[PDB]
Design an enzyme around this catalytic site. Sequence first.
Site, PDB file in Angstrom:
ATOM      1  N   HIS B  46      -3.376   6.982   1.502  1.00  0.00           N
ATOM      2  CA  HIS B  46      -3.516   5.663   0.900  1.00  0.00           C
ATOM      3  C   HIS B  46      -4.949   5.279   0.631  1.00  0.00           C
ATOM      4  O   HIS B  46      -5.866   5.683   1.342  1.00  0.00           O
ATOM      5  CB  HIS B  46      -2.894   4.584   1.786  1.00  0.00           C
ATOM      6  CG  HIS B  46      -1.542   4.938   2.299  1.00  0.00           C
ATOM      7  ND1 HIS B  46      -0.462   5.135   1.467  1.00  0.00           N
ATOM      8  CD2 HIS B  46      -1.093   5.136   3.558  1.00  0.00           C
ATOM      9  CE1 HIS B  46       0.597   5.449   2.191  1.00  0.00           C
ATOM     10  NE2 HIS B  46       0.241   5.453   3.463  1.00  0.00           N
ATOM     11  N   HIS B  48      -7.105   2.177   0.955  1.00  0.00           N
ATOM     12  CA  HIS B  48      -7.105   0.867   1.592  1.00  0.00           C
ATOM     13  C   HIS B  48      -8.166   0.004   0.916  1.00  0.00           C
ATOM     14  O   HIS B  48      -9.076   0.506   0.244  1.00  0.00           O
ATOM     15  CB  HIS B  48      -7.350   0.967   3.108  1.00  0.00           C
ATOM     16  CG  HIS B  48      -6.233   1.621   3.861  1.00  0.00           C
ATOM     17  ND1 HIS B  48      -5.593   1.012   4.922  1.00  0.00           N
ATOM     18  CD2 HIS B  48      -5.637   2.825   3.706  1.00  0.00           C
ATOM     19  CE1 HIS B  48      -4.659   1.814   5.395  1.00  0.00           C
ATOM     20  NE2 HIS B  48      -4.664   2.922   4.676  1.00  0.00           N
ATOM     21  N   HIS B  63      -3.619  -1.674   2.641  1.00  0.00           N
ATOM     22  CA  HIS B  63      -3.635  -0.945   1.371  1.00  0.00           C
ATOM     23  C   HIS B  63      -4.179  -1.824   0.253  1.00  0.00           C
ATOM     24  O   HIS B  63      -3.892  -3.010   0.204  1.00  0.00           O
ATOM     25  CB  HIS B  63      -2.229  -0.429   1.013  1.00  0.00           C
ATOM     26  CG  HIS B  63      -1.664   0.517   2.022  1.00  0.00           C
ATOM     27  ND1 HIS B  63      -0.412   1.079   1.905  1.00  0.00           N
ATOM     28  CD2 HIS B  63      -2.183   0.997   3.180  1.00  0.00           C
ATOM     29  CE1 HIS B  63      -0.180   1.856   2.946  1.00  0.00           C
ATOM     30  NE2 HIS B  63      -1.239   1.825   3.734  1.00  0.00           N
ATOM     31  N   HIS B  71       4.771  -2.555  -0.257  1.00  0.00           N
ATOM     32  CA  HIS B  71       4.528  -1.121  -0.252  1.00  0.00           C
ATOM     33  C   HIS B  71       5.654  -0.311  -0.934  1.00  0.00           C
ATOM     34  O   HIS B  71       6.830  -0.653  -0.844  1.00  0.00           O
ATOM     35  CB  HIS B  71       4.308  -0.645   1.199  1.00  0.00           C
ATOM     36  CG  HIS B  71       4.109   0.830   1.318  1.00  0.00           C
ATOM     37  ND1 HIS B  71       2.919   1.447   0.999  1.00  0.00           N
ATOM     38  CD2 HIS B  71       4.964   1.817   1.670  1.00  0.00           C
ATOM     39  CE1 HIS B  71       3.046   2.750   1.166  1.00  0.00           C
ATOM     40  NE2 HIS B  71       4.276   3.000   1.576  1.00  0.00           N
ATOM     41  N   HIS B  80       1.880  -1.009  -3.914  1.00  0.00           N
ATOM     42  CA  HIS B  80       0.466  -1.362  -3.881  1.00  0.00           C
ATOM     43  C   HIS B  80      -0.286  -0.445  -4.833  1.00  0.00           C
ATOM     44  O   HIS B  80       0.128   0.703  -5.051  1.00  0.00           O
ATOM     45  CB  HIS B  80      -0.110  -1.130  -2.487  1.00  0.00           C
ATOM     46  CG  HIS B  80       0.544  -1.926  -1.404  1.00  0.00           C
ATOM     47  ND1 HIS B  80       0.946  -1.368  -0.211  1.00  0.00           N
ATOM     48  CD2 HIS B  80       0.854  -3.239  -1.326  1.00  0.00           C
ATOM     49  CE1 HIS B  80       1.463  -2.301   0.562  1.00  0.00           C
ATOM     50  NE2 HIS B  80       1.422  -3.446  -0.092  1.00  0.00           N
ATOM     51  N   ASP B  83      -1.241   2.825  -3.269  1.00  0.00           N
ATOM     52  CA  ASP B  83      -0.120   3.639  -2.773  1.00  0.00           C
ATOM     53  C   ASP B  83       0.051   5.035  -3.399  1.00  0.00           C
ATOM     54  O   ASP B  83       0.813   5.200  -4.350  1.00  0.00           O
ATOM     55  CB  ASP B  83       1.197   2.879  -2.876  1.00  0.00           C
ATOM     56  CG  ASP B  83       1.321   1.812  -1.827  1.00  0.00           C
ATOM     57  OD1 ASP B  83       2.306   1.040  -1.867  1.00  0.00           O
ATOM     58  OD2 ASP B  83       0.416   1.746  -0.970  1.00  0.00           O
ATOM     59  N   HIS B 120      -3.007   9.405   6.922  1.00  0.00           N
ATOM     60  CA  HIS B 120      -2.298   8.788   8.043  1.00  0.00           C
ATOM     61  C   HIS B 120      -1.572   9.798   8.934  1.00  0.00           C
ATOM     62  O   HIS B 120      -1.329  10.937   8.539  1.00  0.00           O
ATOM     63  CB  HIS B 120      -1.338   7.686   7.549  1.00  0.00           C
ATOM     64  CG  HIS B 120      -2.032   6.440   7.086  1.00  0.00           C
ATOM     65  ND1 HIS B 120      -2.246   5.358   7.909  1.00  0.00           N
ATOM     66  CD2 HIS B 120      -2.575   6.114   5.890  1.00  0.00           C
ATOM     67  CE1 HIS B 120      -2.881   4.412   7.241  1.00  0.00           C
ATOM     68  NE2 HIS B 120      -3.092   4.843   6.011  1.00  0.00           N
ATOM     69  N   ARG B 143      -4.488   5.925  11.596  1.00  0.00           N
ATOM     70  CA  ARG B 143      -5.401   6.397  10.574  1.00  0.00           C
ATOM     71  C   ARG B 143      -6.161   7.578  11.123  1.00  0.00           C
ATOM     72  O   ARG B 143      -6.978   7.455  12.026  1.00  0.00           O
ATOM     73  CB  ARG B 143      -6.341   5.276  10.157  1.00  0.00           C
ATOM     74  CG  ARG B 143      -5.585   3.985   9.924  1.00  0.00           C
ATOM     75  CD  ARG B 143      -6.470   2.849   9.413  1.00  0.00           C
ATOM     76  NE  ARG B 143      -5.632   1.685   9.123  1.00  0.00           N
ATOM     77  CZ  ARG B 143      -6.035   0.583   8.500  1.00  0.00           C
ATOM     78  NH1 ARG B 143      -7.293   0.469   8.115  1.00  0.00           N
ATOM     79  NH2 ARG B 143      -5.173  -0.408   8.264  1.00  0.00           N
TER      80      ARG B 143
HETATM   81 ZN   LIG Z   1       1.051   0.561   0.487  1.00  0.00          ZN
END
Ligand SMILES: [Zn+2]
Lengths: 153, 153
Positions: B46, B48, B63, B71, B80, B83, B120, B143
């Site tokens: 992702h 962020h 995100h 999401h 997002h 994403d 992640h 993370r």
């Molecule tokens: Zn997301």
Amino acid sequence: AMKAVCVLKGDGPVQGTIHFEQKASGEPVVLSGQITGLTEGQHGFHVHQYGDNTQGCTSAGPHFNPHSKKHGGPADEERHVGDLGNVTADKDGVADVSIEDSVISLSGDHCIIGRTLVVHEKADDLGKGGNEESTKTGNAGSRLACGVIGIAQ
Amino acid sequence: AMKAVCVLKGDGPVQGTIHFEQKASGEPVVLSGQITGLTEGQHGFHVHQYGDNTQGCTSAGPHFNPHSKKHGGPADEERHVGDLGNVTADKDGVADVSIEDSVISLSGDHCIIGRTLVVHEKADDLGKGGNEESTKTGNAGSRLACGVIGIAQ
Ligand SMILES: [Zn+2]
Ligand SMILES: [Zn+2]
């Protein structure tokens, strides 16, 4: 308002955090933070062109220089956009930083977001070292620590 | 043409380098690169919101989500901006990342330069887990490694 932040680290003990604040498009950028692990005295402090640290600090490229000018001090008209002058470490190796600059920006042509902040081995001579390098680099020497400048809250 | 790069570091065994390429403002971003030290299988991948690594990867925020959607996967309609879906590690813990996305961008309102890329701990459920967490982060968990996305040559 725009904010930015940079975490600097390198191959040795130098590390720190620099915050950038810019109230509006046409305002100056204020840097503040701390860097630790430095030798006592002054060290060059520049925005370099690339936010590329795949080879540690060396991959950041040259000082950020959109207009192909010569290296100078922050108060010179003839300076790279990235030329932020010097930063000062105390006897315990701590450098509190507090700088205002109206040539760098957090948006538009001079946006330094996504580029790299570097603290250097030697003092930046501000273009007055009288050899070829002073004109490129201020003779500030090796890149001690760096970080990509990113968007902050 | 726009180029970007991201060096992913973590506190654990995961590290990597990701390259970004966009041919013009309208066109998709192409991502390639490699991450190592992963458990075998899928991991959330992702962008962020903030490029702030002052307290590790957690200071990067949630995100990147300019339009306030929930999401999803990259191919879902509600997602997002940040994403990117999943990245897959082989039995040796290597993910050879290859991704094309037309929602992120290296400029403009969807610009991800100066923001943080995070890999992640778990697989992204693509927003379909039916719990609160799915709706925000895909139940991707912790993370593992991150870096600020920076301008490349
Ligand atoms: Zn997301
Ligand atoms: Zn310079």
